[PDB]
Design a protein around this nucleic acid. Structure first.
Ligand SMILES: Nc1c(C(=O)NCc2ccc(F)cc2F)c(=O)n(O)c2ncc(CCCCCCO)cc12
Ligand SMILES: Nc1c(C(=O)NCc2ccc(F)cc2F)c(=O)n(O)c2ncc(CCCCCCO)cc12
Ligand SMILES: [Mg+2]
Ligand SMILES: [Mg+2]
Ligand SMILES: [Mg+2]
Ligand SMILES: [Mg+2]
Ligand SMILES: [Zn+2]
Ligand SMILES: [Zn+2]
Ligand SMILES: [Zn+2]
Ligand SMILES: [Zn+2]
Lengths: 261, 66, 47, 242, 261, 47, 66, 242
DNA sequence: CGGGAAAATCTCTAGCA
DNA sequence: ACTGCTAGAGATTTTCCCG
DNA sequence: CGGGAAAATCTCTAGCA
DNA sequence: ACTGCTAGAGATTTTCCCG
């Protein structure tokens, strides 16, 4: 055992065995051989086999510059709906990006913009435009395009539709706007069987309607709840469960361990 | 006059996601909507989703049922 | 406490260990040699 | 359902509500309430108005949603048909544009604008647009000093008009009004799609004569025969096409 | 319906709607709208969401040239076991490849070599060496590296191990052979908890032993089988099933619908 | 019989239709304009 | 004298794969081995695998059981 | 198991077979048969031999597996310690090399070869190698005319010797013999690993005194006490470490 | 209740520098 | 302290539709 | 039979031009 | 007529180990 630990460490410093090889060759349990691997700095060469999950609030858009035919297309997507806007811009600068973003913020309720760390988006010009329109900038982790995985995917889809309509237009900007039309209104699927334009109208109208409905519900209902503790705030009650909020933590209790006032 | 608005707010459907599951769970029933969280009811289970993990729609194929 | 080995900036060379300042759903914030970095959890291993 | 239909039709005989109020009040499907409101003899969201205004020696294309007051303005480098068709293609890809109402100028009667309106499927027609032009020029004169170019001032005024000016009945902005109007239009289009989907079904119930289908559930089938609406169970009904 | 088919075709020629958009907008069933999409040549832009499965017979090796530090490493893998051989070659030519392949065929029983369409492997020199050693060449589909997905993966793994031992050697070829040592004998896992060297010894010894055992079984057993048909050949019988081979098709029958002679 | 639309040689442009000579587990052999090509089934759509 | 060789040939384990399943199925029991196919028994099911889809080993952790 | 152990031990008393025959004949685990053959008082696969032969003014390193006759030859550009260490690192990464037996030349006693043999874990020692050298030079003289360079002729002769020449008892080639010998060595190493794994367990059965563990199944525990092997059920046994 | 038919859902891939 | 996704193609499972 | 503990298995990812 | 895979990291399910 312990002699095996010494000999296994001294051979891991040569061969960098995995835990299975040192567990077989030196009679070690998997815990000890795993600890011999996990202490080598040279053996930590793989990360977690997961993916994250982007923010899909109703106010966050994702922006990216893509390139086609030697020209620059600045594309924005509404992350909750898939509604895109796109424009062929003459240059990939901060002035064109701030103009596109101020125009988009004038068109739709933009609350958050998520971009990569391109100079276009990182500039003081786009920073002043987002300060004027009241937009929050959320830059992704550098050299990690998966953080912008919606807009990058939409870049793919946009280019696909341009390849289907490129012979219908003489200029690239006409084909880009035709593809924006086709994506927003002539492609259906997703969560409601909607197109992206119908879906963004449903997302935003639902946000307005549910916000005002919850403002009307919260104004009437005032029931102090004592669960299991202290006085909470009642959020919801239905016939077997009660959802409350004590000290900014939204919890669900049964009708056992609850009493409302 | 209060219960009508509660039944109105339960008419909205929520498509949500869990923490390490990348697939979108189906249309739950919106019980409550907050500034940072959303209380839903999916398959007779009351869940609390973050706001950044939910898509709340009133599906306009409500012209058959609901 | 925790050791973080990570993959920083278009470099296949893994580096570390670093202190784990914050573990989030999807990414981590670490401190390597008084440099605070935000790494995706695909590009990080925490021990 | 049998409780709700008689209540809704006598309520329509009382004070003639529309089908949205009946589908909200009596838990009816909208096709049943639409047939209730459609059996009484006595019982716009795609129209945009375009113009070019002139300011600081430059040309601003202004498109107003007539039902909302929502505005889309753009400084164009020339008042030609190519720039008008590009603006119209952008607008048609952004919003559901069905009809565009212009002032019979030279850049709105172009072959290029006609080709763009044919491609996007827009009808062309030749105190709403100049009222919004005067209000937009007022906002541009307000926020001209906060920008260097006129394009930035026009987009800032479009932001302020669409989201920072609130008027009307409930005190909404033009963006909230246009998303409410377009959501109502999506509901109307989905209802008309479902009505068109079920009008080619005839049912035979309990036999008895051919009746129109209105709703087919999991246990019940709501029919209309001799201008009165009945509810039969599913196994007592034969639903065929015609 | 049919008017909807005409109008939906005429709008698909403009917008290239998917089947869901034309099924919603023109009252079409999914079969008709899917047929409108499936007849457009411009809309067939996605292939089958599958992967194939490489040959893993005990005699097939997969060869590839990889590059590290400005030098060329020619790597072979035994596909059934993961046993690798690798050598830093002075150039990526057909003479070095044919020398490496004749040497490898002299070392192990190589029956098939699977490569990409690199000039090294496509040459007349490697073709003459494989003709001499009796090796069958199986080139993959061009510009499809997934056909060589074993050796490409092993390229990855080999480079990983070189990055763990590069400071232990002064030259690259020493680090390459050290990594071949570590992969073949100091990494355990896979189907038997084996290293790759133990696994290739088990694969090849099992091939020899099972071949001679089946030659001894087939020589004794001669039972003409009539299933359900004609006279087959008995391959196996156990207590509820009988496996036979009639006209080069190996079938399994129950004890019902069988009779052996 | 069958129409095959495919993706040939480091080219994102899809092309076709072609006749399906042979469908195998993993790949297909097709004939486009008297040119016999072997395409992976990830890079081919058969109708 | 024949049955011993049959029990010997059933001591070999087969790791096989199906047509569109990319994951390796567990150690089956080798019933028969041919020039192009391999007859196995996995979970009381007699299967016929191609030769190119099977890895047949005598796992030398047979020094505990089998 | 209780049927097989008495049969195997009386069979060892009869004509003293080894544990492989007992584990094949009586369906015993190899640890039980190893303890049967190990309780009688009266009852190589990693050795390689290296040399340098000289042919056509060039140097050929030849390494022979002594147990098999399997050969690995390579034309090296110089008879130095660097080329010998590179050949040895290739051979050690290819096959399980445990001991290398050389002829105490100048290139086999180098510090480079010593460092390579230390890294790979090879012991060095200073009518098998020259017999294989003469047989290999005979094959090189046979197939020299089918190649242009001497490297190709050496690799062709290594192919012919390892796979196209069959002799010995059963008429096998050197490649079949080396994979049989190395598979037998893997079996021996796995058996010694399992024996080393269970020697630090002592069992108490039915109590009664400490006994050695030999096999632990799903229902039975095979022990050895007072140099006789018993089989107890699992619940009548306490297995602890020592 | 029960077989086909059809719809819905699950699985998986390329491409997005 | 932040984060892969999207749409299509085929397989598979569930629902429907009258007997 | 039953709870922790441990082993085995499932899920998923980067990198391989 | 040919074809993604491999090893590691973490989660999860199954087996074990004595009460
Ligand atoms: N590499 C960029 C990609 C890109 O690789 N895509 C492909 C891509 C790859 C994987 C994936 F999962 C999704 C994807 F899409 C991309 O799409 N866009 O937009 C980019 N935009 C800007 C910059 C430069 C960053 C500026 C330096 C930062 C200094 O702090 C790089 C990129
Ligand atoms: N692109 C090559 C790759 C390669 O992209 N790997 C990365 C890679 C990508 C995806 C994948 F799933 C597995 C992988 F590994 C690779 O690995 N090797 O070896 C290659 N070798 C030779 C040639 C050139 C072909 C000669 C022209 C053919 C004319 O007919 C190209 C390549
Ligand atoms: Mg970018
Ligand atoms: Mg991008
Ligand atoms: Mg290659
Ligand atoms: Mg390669
Ligand atoms: Zn290490
Ligand atoms: Zn009326
Ligand atoms: Zn099309
Ligand atoms: Zn004896």
């Amino acid at each position: 055992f312990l002699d095996g630990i010494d000999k296994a460490q001294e051979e891991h410093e040569k061969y960098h065995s995995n835990w299975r090889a040192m567990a077989s060759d030196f009679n070690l349990p998997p815990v000890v051989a795993k600890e011999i691997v996990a202490s080598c700095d040279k053996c930590q060469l793989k990360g977690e086999a997961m993916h994250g999950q982007v923010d899909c609030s109703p106010g966050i858009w994702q922006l990216d510059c893509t390139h086609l035919e030697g020209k620059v297309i600045l594309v924005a997507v509404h992350v909750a709906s898939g509604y895109i806007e796109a424009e062929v811009i003459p240059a990939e600068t901060g002035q064109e990006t701030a103009y596109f973003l101020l125009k988009l913020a004038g068109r739709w309720p933009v609350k958050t913009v998520h971009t990569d760390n391109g100079s276009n988006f990182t500039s003081t010009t786009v920073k002043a435009a987002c300060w004027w329109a009241g937009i929050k900038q959320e830059f992704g982790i550098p050299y990690n395009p998966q953080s912008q995985g919606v807009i990058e995917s939409m870049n793919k889809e946009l280019k696909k539709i341009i390849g289907q309509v490129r012979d219908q237009a003489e200029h690239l900007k006409t084909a880009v706007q035709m593809a924006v039309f086709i994506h927003n209104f002539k492609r259906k699927g997703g969560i409601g069987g909607y197109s992206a334009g119908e879906r963004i109208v449903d997302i935003i109208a639902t946000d307005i309607q549910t916000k005002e409905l919850q403002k009307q519900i919260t104004k009437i209902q005032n029931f102090r709840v004592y669960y299991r503790k202290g006085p909470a705030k009642l959020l919801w009650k239905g016939e077997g469960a009660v959802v409350i909020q004590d000290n900014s933590d939204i919890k669900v209790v049964p009708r056992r361990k609850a009493k409302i006032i | 006059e209060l219960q009508k608005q509660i039944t109105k707010i339960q008419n909205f459907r929520v498509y949500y996601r869990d923490s390490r599951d990348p697939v979108w769970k189906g249309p739950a029933k919106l019980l409550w909507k907050g500034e940072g969280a959303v209380v839903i009811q999916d398959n007779s289970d009351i869940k609390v989703v973050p706001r950044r993990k939910a898509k709340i729609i009133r599906d306009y194929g409500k012209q058959m049922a609901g | 406490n925790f050791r973080v080995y990570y993959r920083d900036s278009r470099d296949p060379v893994w580096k570390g260990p670093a202190k784990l300042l914050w573990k989030g759903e999807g990414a981590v914030v670490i401190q390597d040699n008084s440099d605070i970095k935000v790494v995706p959890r695909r590009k990080a291993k925490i021990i």
